[PDB]
């Protein structure tokens, strides 16, 4: 059952299984050559009883060490290479998924955690493919192959190892886990004290103004006393754990190596068979660590595969389906539309309005009262739960999101400065073979050109978390230049959520005034005073509405919530 998704996740990378198979095979053949070195050494050590060295025996041991190293090296490369080509394929698939997910995905799921998916979870599967599967398979063959040769070569000394090794681990493992618990307990008390000092030192002015220097000292002195009473328990425990580990491990070693030595002097064994036995003990006790490592890792890695195949399961945003748009200079309408993240818990209910062509229609109201939902529905960031948004005759789901997002233009005042060249940020995603004669003219109209020419180069600069960093009206003008160069029919303007005051007003207000001409403009307001001269203003509260006029017309004709004209 449980391993079914892991091979389905690997298969879709086109992994060329013949090359992985061979690499695994060579890993096995290498391990069977490790078992032969101590038998060649037995033949050397026993043969030297006639004490002239047969030079061909020590040459054959060296030749087998070099063949061992060649097959180990090719196998290690082959595993690594093929694993690196799988990880890159998974990366690729997660990336193109991520990049096309509905943007609502990102509301529910933390961006930085998503990135961890791509980066970390892929790594975890790499380790299994490259390292742990081979390590397991080879480890098993090494341990069983060592013990089956040992049992044929001397059974009594093997039975002693099969008693001593688990009887030692039966004593060491309970002791290891108890010792580790006291280490963790001491780290938690150290964090608790560190937190006591970290709260007293920023308060130090009040501590001194109060004459409280003696009482804070007494309370810190209590905190070093609990660290001391805990540290003397760690000292008591570790004084039994330390010498008990040394006693059990050498007593085991003295019993095994010493009983083998007693058989050689007794005549029950040869000096070469003791040399072979000592060489196989490394080939048992060392790859037992890679065996346990496999099980250790598989527990976390299997979760990682479910954690990724999750992602690849998600719905993509279908941008291409439906009609292409023409003549978007038509009245938008919302027709008794609703929205919510559940069928019951509506954020917006049965709302109706028209948004006229070549007109300005501002959106306003109390925070959380519904404004952001009405705007995200018109920006098609969300799809409505019932009713239709319309564009003249047709419901807007008639039209391709790729075509809708070519006719709208988005500008946020709390503007994100994405990393790149100052020109590329003015034609971002605008695949039209654009020339600097046009890019300059868009920067002119945006009142950016005179500032751009002030930067280190006449028309280049790198910006973002790298290069030049820009504030307020400098980033906002290159955004208005991007908007201007795209030629939108509908403009969708997002005021600052963090509620900053506007900067260098005369330039950015003039840049907007040239962007807005002839454009159907929808704007969402975080303070009411920024939109008061609009042709139409919409007031949204508790997922319902009352505003359907210009500001002074509504303030005269309706006035049921005059308070928001006082709070502003």
Secondary-structure breakdown of the chain: helix, strand, coil percentages, each rounded to the nearest 5: 60, 10, 30
Nearer residue to a second copy within complex by CB, 334 or 408: 408
Give yes or no for a contact between 539 and 344, defined as CB atoms under 8 angstroms apart.
no
Does 48 interact with a second copy (rule: CB under 8 A)?
A: yes
Residue 72: closest CA among 104, 46, 37, 38? 37
Output Rg (C-alpha) for the chain, integer angstroms: 37
Residue 81 beta carbon to a second copy: minimum distance, rounded to whole angstroms: 5
Nearer residue to a second copy within complex by CB, 74 or 561: 74
Q: Which stretch binds a second copy (CB under 8 A): 270-278, 297-305, 468-476, 508-516?
A: 270-278
Nearer residue to a second copy within complex by CB, 346 or 377: 377
When binding is defined by CB under 8 A, the residue of 14, 54, 239, 567 that contacts a second copy is: 239
Residue 9: closest CA among 305, 297, 301? 305
* β 348-355/520-524 pair status: unpaired
Site for a second copy in 343-372 (CB under 8 A): none
C-alpha span between 404 and 319 (Å, rounded): 9
- 55 carries a ligand binding annotation: no
Instruction: Supply 534's token pair.
Output: 């609009």
Nearer residue to a second copy within complex by CB, 85 or 349: 85
Site for a second copy in 80-99 (CB under 8 A): 80-81, 84-85, 87-88, 91-92, 95-96, 98-99
Site for a second copy in 105-124 (CB under 8 A): 106, 111-112, 114-115, 118-119
Checking the chain for breaks where C and the next N are over 2.5 Å apart, the residues before them are none
Nearer residue to a second copy within complex by CB, 405 or 441: 405
* β 348-355/386-391 pair status: unpaired
C-alpha span between 260 and 274 (Å, rounded): 6
Burial track 302-331 (b if 16+ CB lie within 10 A, e otherwise): bebbebbeebeeeeeeeeeebeebeebebe
C-alpha span between 364 and 551 (Å, rounded): 11
Residue 352 beta carbon to a second copy: minimum distance, rounded to whole angstroms: 26
Residue 504 beta carbon to a second copy: minimum distance, rounded to whole angstroms: 18
Does 231 interact with a second copy (rule: CB under 8 A)?
A: yes
Decide: helix, strand or coil at residue 534.
coil
Q: Which stretch binds a second copy (CB under 8 A): 239-247, 292-300, 328-336, 386-394?
A: 239-247
C-alpha span between 242 and 248 (Å, rounded): 11
Q: State in Å, rounded, how far the first CA of the chain is from the last one.
A: 61
C-alpha span between 44 and 265 (Å, rounded): 19
Does 272 interact with a second copy (rule: CB under 8 A)?
A: yes
C-alpha span between 429 and 426 (Å, rounded): 9
Does 22 interact with a second copy (rule: CB under 8 A)?
A: no
C-alpha span between 380 and 368 (Å, rounded): 19
Residue 325 beta carbon to a second copy: minimum distance, rounded to whole angstroms: 13
Site for a second copy in 148-167 (CB under 8 A): none
- 543 carries a ligand binding annotation: no
Q: Which stretch binds a second copy (CB under 8 A): 14-22, 142-150, 337-345, 406-414?
A: 406-414
Q: Which stretch binds a second copy (CB under 8 A): 194-202, 433-441, 540-548, 552-560?
A: 194-202
Residue 472 DSSP label: T
Nearer residue to a second copy within complex by CB, 65 or 295: 65
Site for a second copy in 273-332 (CB under 8 A): 274-275, 278-279, 282, 317, 319
When binding is defined by CB under 8 A, the residue of 21, 144, 173, 232 that contacts a second copy is: 232
Nearer residue to a second copy within complex by CB, 322 or 549: 322
- 83 carries a ligand binding annotation: no
Q: Which stretch binds a second copy (CB under 8 A): 3-11, 205-213, 366-374, 503-511?
A: 205-213
Give yes or no for a contact between 493 and 523, defined as CB atoms under 8 angstroms apart.
yes
When binding is defined by CB under 8 A, the residue of 1, 228, 344, 563 that contacts a second copy is: 228
Residue 206 beta carbon to a second copy: minimum distance, rounded to whole angstroms: 6
Count residues near a second copy (CB under 8 A). Answer: 123
Nearer residue to a second copy within complex by CB, 194 or 327: 194
When binding is defined by CB under 8 A, the residue of 21, 32, 418, 514 that contacts a second copy is: 418
> Cα 465–466–471 angle (5° rounding)?
60
When binding is defined by CB under 8 A, the residue of 68, 385, 398, 421 that contacts a second copy is: 68
Site for a second copy in 25-44 (CB under 8 A): 37, 41, 44
Site for a second copy in 422-451 (CB under 8 A): 428-431
Residue 552 beta carbon to a second copy: minimum distance, rounded to whole angstroms: 29
Site for a second copy in 478-497 (CB under 8 A): none
Residue 228's contacts (CB-CB under 8 Å, 6 or more residues apart) are none
- Cα 213 vs. chain centroid, distance in angstroms? 46
When binding is defined by CB under 8 A, the residue of 20, 408, 478, 538 that contacts a second copy is: 408
When binding is defined by CB under 8 A, the residue of 32, 251, 285, 386 that contacts a second copy is: 251
C-alpha span between 64 and 185 (Å, rounded): 51
Strands (E), 276-392: 332-339, 348-355, 360-364, 386-391
Give the residue numbers annotated as catalytic, written as ranges.
Answer: 495
Residue 411 pairs in a beta bridge with 493
When binding is defined by CB under 8 A, the residue of 227, 302, 354, 532 that contacts a second copy is: 227
Burial track 73-98 (b if 16+ CB lie within 10 A, e otherwise): eebbebbeebbeebbebbeebbeebb
Decide: helix, strand or coil at residue 407.
helix
Nearer residue to a second copy within complex by CB, 425 or 536: 425
Residues flagged as binding site for ATP: 365-372
Residues flagged as binding site: 365-372
């Amino acid at each position: 059952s449980k391993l079914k998704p892991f091979f389905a996740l690997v298969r879709r990378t086109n992994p060329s299984y013949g090359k992985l198979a061979f690499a695994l095979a060579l890993s096995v053949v290498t391990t069977l050559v490790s078992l032969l070195i101590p038998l060649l050494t037995k033949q050397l050590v026993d043969g030297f009883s006639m004490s002239n060295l047969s030079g061909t025996q020590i040459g054959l041991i060296a030749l087998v060490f070099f063949v061992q190293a060649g097959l180990s090296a090719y196998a290690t490369y082959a595993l690594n290479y093929n694993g690196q080509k799988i990880i890159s394929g998974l990366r690729e698939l997660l990336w193109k998924k991520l990049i096309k997910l509905p943007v609502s995905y990102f509301d529910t799921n933390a961006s930085g955690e998503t990135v961890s998916r791509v980066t970390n979870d892929t790594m975890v599967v790499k380790e299994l493919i490259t390292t742990h599967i081979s390590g397991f398979i080879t480890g098993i063959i090494s341990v069983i192959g060592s013990l089956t040769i040992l049992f044929i070569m001397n059974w009594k000394l093997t039975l002693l190892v099969l008693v001593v090794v688990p009887l030692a681990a039966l004593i060491l493992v309970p002791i290891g886990r108890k010792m580790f618990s006291i280490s963790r307990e001491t780290q938690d008390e150290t964090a608790r004290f560190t937190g006591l000092l970290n709260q007293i030192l920023p308060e130090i002015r009040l501590v001194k103004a109060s004459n409280a220097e003696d009482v804070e000292y007494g309370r810190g002195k209590m905190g070093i006393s609990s660290l001391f009473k805990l540290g003397v328990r760690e000292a008591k425990v570790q004084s039994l754990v330390g010498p008990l580990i040394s006693l059990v491990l050498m007593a085991a070693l003295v019993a095994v190596i010493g009983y083998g030595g007693m058989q050689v002097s007794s005549g029950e064994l040869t000096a070469g068979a003791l040399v072979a036995f000592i060489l196989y003990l490394f080939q048992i006790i060392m790859p037992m660590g890679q065996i346990t490592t496999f099980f250790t890792q598989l527990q976390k890695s299997i979760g990682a595969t479910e954690r990724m195949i999750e992602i690849l399961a998600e719905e993509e945003e279908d941008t291409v389906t439906g009609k292409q748009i023409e003549n978007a200079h038509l009245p938008i309408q919302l027709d008794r539309v609703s929205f919510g993240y559940k069928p019951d818990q509506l954020i917006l209910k049965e709302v109706s309005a028209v948004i006229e062509a070549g007109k300005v229609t501002a959106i306003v109201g109390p925070s959380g009262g519904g404004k952001t939902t009405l705007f995200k529905l018109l920006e098609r960031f969300y799809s409505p739960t019932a009713g239709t948004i319309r564009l003249g005759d047709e419901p807007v789901d008639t039209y391709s999101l790729e075509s809708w997002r070519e006719h709208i233009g988005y500008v946020s005042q709390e503007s994100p400065l994405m990393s790149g060249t100052i020109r590329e940020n003015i034609c971002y995603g605008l695949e039209r073979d654009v020339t600097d004669a046009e890019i300059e003219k868009a920067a002119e109209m945006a009142y950016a050109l005179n500032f751009i020419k002030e930067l280190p180069n006449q028309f280049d600069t790198e910006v973002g978390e790298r290069g030049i960093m820009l504030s307020g009206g400098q980033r906002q003008r290159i955004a208005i230049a991007r908007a201007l160069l795209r030629n939108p029919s509908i403009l969708m303007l997002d005021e600052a959520t963090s509620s900053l005051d506007s900067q260098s007003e005369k330039s950015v207000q003039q840049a907007l005034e040239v962007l807005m001409e002839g454009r159907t403009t929808i704007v969402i307001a975080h303070r009411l005073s920024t939109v008061v001269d609009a042709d139409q203003l919409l007031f949204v509260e508790k997922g319902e509405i009352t505003g359907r006029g210009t500001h002074h017309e509504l303030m005269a004709s309706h006035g049921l919530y005059r308070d928001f004209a006082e709070q502003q």
